[PDB]
Design a protein around this ligand. Sequence first.
Ligand SMILES: NC(=O)c1ccc[n+]([C@@H]2O[C@H](COP(=O)([O-])OP(=O)(O)OC[C@H]3O[C@@H](n4cnc5c(N)ncnc54)[C@H](O)[C@@H]3O)[C@@H](O)[C@H]2O)c1
Ligand SMILES: NC(=O)c1ccc[n+]([C@@H]2O[C@H](COP(=O)([O-])OP(=O)(O)OC[C@H]3O[C@@H](n4cnc5c(N)ncnc54)[C@H](O)[C@@H]3O)[C@@H](O)[C@H]2O)c1
Ligand SMILES: NC(=O)c1ccc[n+]([C@@H]2O[C@H](COP(=O)([O-])OP(=O)(O)OC[C@H]3O[C@@H](n4cnc5c(N)ncnc54)[C@H](O)[C@@H]3O)[C@@H](O)[C@H]2O)c1
Ligand SMILES: Nc1nc2c(ncn2[C@@H]2O[C@H](COP(=O)(O)OP(=O)(O)OP(=O)(O)O)[C@@H](O)[C@H]2O)c(=O)[nH]1
Ligand SMILES: Nc1nc2c(ncn2[C@@H]2O[C@H](COP(=O)(O)OP(=O)(O)OP(=O)(O)O)[C@@H](O)[C@H]2O)c(=O)[nH]1
Ligand SMILES: Nc1nc2c(ncn2[C@@H]2O[C@H](COP(=O)(O)OP(=O)(O)OP(=O)(O)O)[C@@H](O)[C@H]2O)c(=O)[nH]1
Ligand SMILES: Nc1nc2c(ncn2[C@@H]2O[C@H](COP(=O)(O)OP(=O)(O)OP(=O)(O)O)[C@@H](O)[C@H]2O)c(=O)[nH]1
Ligand SMILES: Nc1nc2c(ncn2[C@@H]2O[C@H](COP(=O)(O)OP(=O)(O)OP(=O)(O)O)[C@@H](O)[C@H]2O)c(=O)[nH]1
Ligand SMILES: Nc1nc2c(ncn2[C@@H]2O[C@H](COP(=O)(O)OP(=O)(O)OP(=O)(O)O)[C@@H](O)[C@H]2O)c(=O)[nH]1
Ligand SMILES: O=c1[nH]cnc2c1ncn2[C@@H]1O[C@H](COP(=O)(O)O)[C@@H](O)[C@H]1O
Ligand SMILES: O=c1[nH]cnc2c1ncn2[C@@H]1O[C@H](COP(=O)(O)O)[C@@H](O)[C@H]1O
Ligand SMILES: O=c1[nH]cnc2c1ncn2[C@@H]1O[C@H](COP(=O)(O)O)[C@@H](O)[C@H]1O
Lengths: 422, 422, 422
Amino acid sequence: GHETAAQRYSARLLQAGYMADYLISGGTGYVPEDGLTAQQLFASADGLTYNDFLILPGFIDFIADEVDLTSALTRKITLKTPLISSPMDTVTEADMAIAMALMGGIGFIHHNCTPEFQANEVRKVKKFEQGFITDPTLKEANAIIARTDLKKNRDYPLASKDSQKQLLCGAAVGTREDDKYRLDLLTQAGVDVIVLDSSQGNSVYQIAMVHYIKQKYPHLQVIGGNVVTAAQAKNLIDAGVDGLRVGMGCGSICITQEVMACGRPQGTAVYKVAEYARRFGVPIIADGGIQTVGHVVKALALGASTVMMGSLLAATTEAPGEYFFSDGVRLKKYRGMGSLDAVKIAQGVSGSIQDKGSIQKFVPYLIAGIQHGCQDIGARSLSVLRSMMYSGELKFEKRTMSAQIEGGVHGLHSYTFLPFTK
Amino acid sequence: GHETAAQRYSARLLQAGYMADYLISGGTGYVPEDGLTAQQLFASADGLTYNDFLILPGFIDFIADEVDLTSALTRKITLKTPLISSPMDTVTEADMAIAMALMGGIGFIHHNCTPEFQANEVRKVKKFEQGFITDPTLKEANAIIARTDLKKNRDYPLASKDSQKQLLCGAAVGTREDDKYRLDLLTQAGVDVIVLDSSQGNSVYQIAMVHYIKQKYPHLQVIGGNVVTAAQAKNLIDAGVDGLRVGMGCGSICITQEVMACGRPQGTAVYKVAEYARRFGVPIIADGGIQTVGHVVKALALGASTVMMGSLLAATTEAPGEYFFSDGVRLKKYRGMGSLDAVKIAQGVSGSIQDKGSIQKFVPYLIAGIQHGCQDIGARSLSVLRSMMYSGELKFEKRTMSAQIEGGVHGLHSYTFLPFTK
Amino acid sequence: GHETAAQRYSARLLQAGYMADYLISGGTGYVPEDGLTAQQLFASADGLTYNDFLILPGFIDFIADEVDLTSALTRKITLKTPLISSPMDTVTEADMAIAMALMGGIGFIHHNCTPEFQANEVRKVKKFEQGFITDPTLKEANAIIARTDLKKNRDYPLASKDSQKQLLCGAAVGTREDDKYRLDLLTQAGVDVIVLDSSQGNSVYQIAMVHYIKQKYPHLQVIGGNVVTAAQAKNLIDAGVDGLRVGMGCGSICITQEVMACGRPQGTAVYKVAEYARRFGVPIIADGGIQTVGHVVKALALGASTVMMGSLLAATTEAPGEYFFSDGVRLKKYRGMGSLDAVKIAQGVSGSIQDKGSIQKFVPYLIAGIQHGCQDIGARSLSVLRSMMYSGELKFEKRTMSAQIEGGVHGLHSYTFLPFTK
Ligand SMILES: NC(=O)c1ccc[n+]([C@@H]2O[C@H](COP(=O)([O-])OP(=O)(O)OC[C@H]3O[C@@H](n4cnc5c(N)ncnc54)[C@H](O)[C@@H]3O)[C@@H](O)[C@H]2O)c1
Ligand SMILES: NC(=O)c1ccc[n+]([C@@H]2O[C@H](COP(=O)([O-])OP(=O)(O)OC[C@H]3O[C@@H](n4cnc5c(N)ncnc54)[C@H](O)[C@@H]3O)[C@@H](O)[C@H]2O)c1
Ligand SMILES: NC(=O)c1ccc[n+]([C@@H]2O[C@H](COP(=O)([O-])OP(=O)(O)OC[C@H]3O[C@@H](n4cnc5c(N)ncnc54)[C@H](O)[C@@H]3O)[C@@H](O)[C@H]2O)c1
Ligand SMILES: Nc1nc2c(ncn2[C@@H]2O[C@H](COP(=O)(O)OP(=O)(O)OP(=O)(O)O)[C@@H](O)[C@H]2O)c(=O)[nH]1
Ligand SMILES: Nc1nc2c(ncn2[C@@H]2O[C@H](COP(=O)(O)OP(=O)(O)OP(=O)(O)O)[C@@H](O)[C@H]2O)c(=O)[nH]1
Ligand SMILES: Nc1nc2c(ncn2[C@@H]2O[C@H](COP(=O)(O)OP(=O)(O)OP(=O)(O)O)[C@@H](O)[C@H]2O)c(=O)[nH]1
Ligand SMILES: Nc1nc2c(ncn2[C@@H]2O[C@H](COP(=O)(O)OP(=O)(O)OP(=O)(O)O)[C@@H](O)[C@H]2O)c(=O)[nH]1
Ligand SMILES: Nc1nc2c(ncn2[C@@H]2O[C@H](COP(=O)(O)OP(=O)(O)OP(=O)(O)O)[C@@H](O)[C@H]2O)c(=O)[nH]1
Ligand SMILES: Nc1nc2c(ncn2[C@@H]2O[C@H](COP(=O)(O)OP(=O)(O)OP(=O)(O)O)[C@@H](O)[C@H]2O)c(=O)[nH]1
Ligand SMILES: O=c1[nH]cnc2c1ncn2[C@@H]1O[C@H](COP(=O)(O)O)[C@@H](O)[C@H]1O
Ligand SMILES: O=c1[nH]cnc2c1ncn2[C@@H]1O[C@H](COP(=O)(O)O)[C@@H](O)[C@H]1O
Ligand SMILES: O=c1[nH]cnc2c1ncn2[C@@H]1O[C@H](COP(=O)(O)O)[C@@H](O)[C@H]1O
């Protein structure tokens, strides 16, 4: 079980020079109560997003580099990094999925393509790094073996690998009858995990699909389609999903709230669905609305096990399509899967995003920002962070609008922002 | 009464393979409580508009195309679509009224014109589609009969018709003595329903008019002029109106709040007047402030039986007047009936709206968006939607300002929005 | 720090036969929230006594006999039992003080007597069990040594002893100038600890006395005379007391509330003064209003380190004075120190109490009742109990009057109560 700020502070005073105190409170230790708990924070029933609150700083007794980012993707899959690339056709094909797996996250390949194309993109990921090449003890390396996989293994210390030392790959499927043929090809191609990709996952079509998959492929991991209430999470956990995607109407390319009136503010949705799903041991993906490393840290602190990004990974070099320069700045398209670009009504807008270079120079920046966020909180790992949140030890503070203005840049005439140097 | 999400989910699990549970709860089923009810939502006494809240998603066991939109306009008139065109001189004359009646709603012809002109515009609507042409068993189709009316029937399966197979038409009148002569001509022209068109309907002039109409034309339907409180709704329901228009100071061309200090935020007004009016079996029109299909779904979920649009139908081809290209885009004028364009003080601003093409290519888009909004809620019809709201099954969530920013488009460089493809 | 119910339950499931769960919550474990915390309980600002609330049951993974009752009397004195006999002339002289010291608590000898008499009663306690009799390695047991003290050791394994193997004794003094000579005699007699014994301890007279004692006898332990607010506790902790007595106007012989309007309900007083005093490492004595072993457990759970009894120890055989049979039942007198039996106004009533036999057959009953109360809470010690209270793990429930009626004996015709059999 996790150690409280007072316990750590006492052990560190005790390692050094600088009875009734133990007998009185028995190692709980007086700390002045300040801020709110997640429970109090969300009792008000305002609709909070990530911008509406702050996390209060804690006690530091470690450096940032030693923060453990190990996360559950599902009941059975673990990642060394909490980051996931979204199953969108402007975000995740084999190159993005390979890159995310190498940096210790995972990518879900999109399904706005033919079944044979998606299965080939999955096979490209599973082929990229190899133990024994059986279709040309594994300790014999230092069927075929090649030193290039030892170089990959050296160069990428966090890489998400299966038992055969191949990269992990996810894929999307819908809830239509012809998705049964996709899933046959994807399970032949060696896919590790599935997302069912509904905008609203609490449906007979999705529940029938979850029961069909758990019957035909009982070793396959399945993640529930998008939910934002505990009542939706109940029926998918009772259908036997191994994880959930959380978020509806948030996400930068989205218009579903203004078209359909359904959705939820993403902070409350992540907190409420995670606080329900933990009772059954089910991990949460927080999906959409992630603009900054502070949104990743907030999503994780509210109980998300992993964070899924669309826009923040769009216009990296590994994202699908090509750059086009049109506005006098280097731009790549980013479309939304319910745009009419991707009666039928649009659920999303098709747009464009400025260039960010490679995933491999940008994900270690998100990792470093998550570690430094966890260090100022006093969390030695992400499991310790969620543990402190559920126990009340972690404190929160609501923001007014003037407070959010004050949390940005003020009356400078001009400024330059450089986020990271190397 | 309607069936609950747990009842529907249980029947669906029961149609298939996948005792104490029934004996304990009597089939109610456990659903984790999440969100607010309309009652809790409006207990806070903040002034909520449609932008200030969301509807939480439900349980889906049907496709969107089978959502029933049948609505009550008054105690005795039913429409197959909840949409009404507003009685403004830049919105509703015979062409708009014909188009709305044909797509399954109704139009109220404006009164900023002579009594003889308004009666001629009403007669143009009542003539457009005919059964027995008596002024050149009806199943004789397959005293004159024309096949063009059979074609009209074939092409418009939701047309709002009277017993004689003619389109429904509404008209406006004021509460002056000379409005008694208008109403003689309009009832000779065959008008089906009246609106009394006040800014503030709770007046002796209006109550005297409602009593005069119900005395002279006892078969005529009358809709009360604008109200925003239950105390105003009481005196008009007691005078014997068959419906109410709800909204004061909202509506895109309006300035009444800044000029007069009177009004109400339209969400609260629709909820509070509809909650009162249902006790007497009186339908509500939600009038003004409708910018999106999500505003229509929200207005209907709060208890409105029908929704009346000005701006959203302005600059369609059937809207009065001509296009004029002035700002480098095709524009039509949209004036507000208390603008000085239409001491005398302005209640509204005269302005301009961009072209949208025909009502007949734009109303099936609003219908499709209402159906998809009701599908994500779990409502098989609009009646079921309002039933779930009054019974607490439907849940709501308030939005902060950062939450409404998150419900729009985020840090895209640029975006294109196409609302519908066909 | 203490281990939580979820942590203990998980280790006990783990010792036996009957991953994402650890990665999600960091071992905190889901437990459904129920009841109130001490903080919430006292936020209401009602005046709660011990009868107004209950402690909610926890998780058991130990037997009662292994509950540790070790307690702090002051910053430097520890007792193996949390029970103290009150400094009243119908309760504590040498025989009661010897008996309490032998069963593992302590007695404070009363000051309603000459200084020489009080010093002789203190000397009688310090003489009773001896190590080296120097006024006729100590491992020499197996300058005089007697086997009777070895037998005393054998028979009383919880006796409160000093370094010289003598029983601990406390004494009372007032805050008058003539108490300076009294305290010189008590420190010659070998007293271990002092109580300053006031109705209202927050006075210049008591603060001047605390400063005088800490100057002249810097190794002597001093407990501050009675307080019921954090503002009173501040000035005595700042004067340098080593403990506080908490309670004003409670206590069975008391009338101070009806005479003076001052006091506090004893539950709130114990909670609020203990919550303040823990910030400085100062133990609390809960003083008066103890009628049942459940009052002792409640006082200790609210943050009291020890509990002081008057009435519950009155009319034991070791209590001062002689028995009488005036009402057919066997009785002793029990007087209150501000009664006029003990213009001047009474603060207390002089009365009578029924016989209970010896301290040595009645204190092991209070010990067994405290252990069984801590077992149902799931507290392995009193330190762990207070730790669970300050950390929110321990839950409370308020009682209505009908609830208190239901917590007693109901519609029986008659009943017999035997509290303990051996
Ligand atoms: N998370 C969001 O906020 C959000 C919102 C809108 C769209 N999207 C994305 O856009 C894409 C499309 O989402 P979607 O929800 O429109 O796809 P969808 O296929 O789940 O839903 C489209 C329609 O088809 C229906 N449907 C689904 N399976 C069916 C079946 N077997 N039989 C009959 N009807 C069936 C649905 O109920 C719905 O009316 C996905 O990539 C999704 O992630 C996401
Ligand atoms: N819903 C709104 O928020 C809103 C606000 C302002 C105007 N409007 C619209 O503008 C138009 C004008 O509305 P209006 O209310 O100003 O017109 P109105 O003629 O009803 O009211 C104008 C004034 O005349 C008075 N009046 C009405 N009947 C009278 C009678 N018989 N004898 C004496 N005085 C009488 C009214 O009390 C008011 O002082 C309408 O189309 C209306 O729908 C709407
Ligand atoms: N805890 C209670 O609820 C409570 C209430 C009343 C009495 N008592 C008990 O009864 C006994 C008497 O208590 P008490 O408070 O009346 O005794 P006390 O001597 O402390 O107070 C009596 C009066 O003398 C004053 N006084 C004290 N020291 C003084 C000094 N040096 N110079 C001048 N004035 C001084 C006090 O302020 C008060 O007015 C004690 O045993 C006490 O514990 C307890
Ligand atoms: N040789 C080989 N490599 C494979 C195959 N499938 C996957 N790989 C991967 O290909 C990667 C590249 O290895 P290299 O050492 O660069 O192979 P190479 O030098 O290009 O081999 P040549 O094609 O013979 O020139 C390794 O990480 C292998 O795991 C396969 O069928 N054959
Ligand atoms: N042939 C081959 N050997 C590998 C590969 N990955 C790891 N190994 C070897 O198998 C052993 C695995 O230990 P690690 O490399 O520490 O852990 P890992 O999880 O397998 O891989 P990394 O996450 O890349 O460190 C080492 O001897 C590796 O060199 C791979 O892709 N191909
Ligand atoms: N013929 C006729 N049609 C009417 C009259 N009043 C309304 N209508 C409508 O006119 C519509 C058009 O019918 P068409 O078949 O196009 O009539 P048409 O071919 O223009 O008739 P002609 O004028 O003889 O050329 C039908 O939907 C009728 O309901 C009327 O007095 N006479
Ligand atoms: N001459 C004529 N016959 C009609 C008209 N509308 C309906 N009918 C006929 O009268 C019957 C009505 O059929 P329906 O279409 O099912 O009922 P409806 O609601 O009036 O019309 P729809 O909206 O088209 O469904 C049918 O026998 C039609 O042929 C009309 O406008 N003109
Ligand atoms: N011998 C002795 N024992 C003392 C003295 N003060 C206290 N005691 C206690 O008295 C007890 C000794 O009891 P006994 O051995 O029976 O001595 P006694 O009570 O004097 O009985 P007799 O010797 O028979 O008169 C021990 O517990 C001592 O601690 C003292 O001055 N002398
Ligand atoms: N002569 C004498 N020896 C004692 C006395 N009390 C303890 N001792 C001795 O000193 C040691 C105390 O051991 P313990 O009995 O375990 O601990 P304690 O706190 O002193 O006393 P207990 O409560 O009996 O445990 C032992 O070696 C005893 O023999 C006493 O009262 N008189
Ligand atoms: O058309 C759409 N409408 C609504 N949400 C979408 C659509 N397409 C994708 N999404 C969601 O948007 C998320 C990306 O959000 P972003 O990272 O903030 O840009 C994805 O992971 C999907 O869950
Ligand atoms: O001059 C005016 N001032 C205030 N409200 C008006 C005026 N003229 C019309 N309205 C209202 O505005 C509604 C249209 O609102 P809109 O659809 O949001 O533009 C109409 O249906 C009337 O109820
Ligand atoms: O005369 C008095 N008036 C008020 N309180 C008293 C008086 N004498 C003693 N006390 C307090 O009463 C406590 C005993 O309470 P009891 O055990 O409930 O009877 C003592 O420990 C004192 O703190």
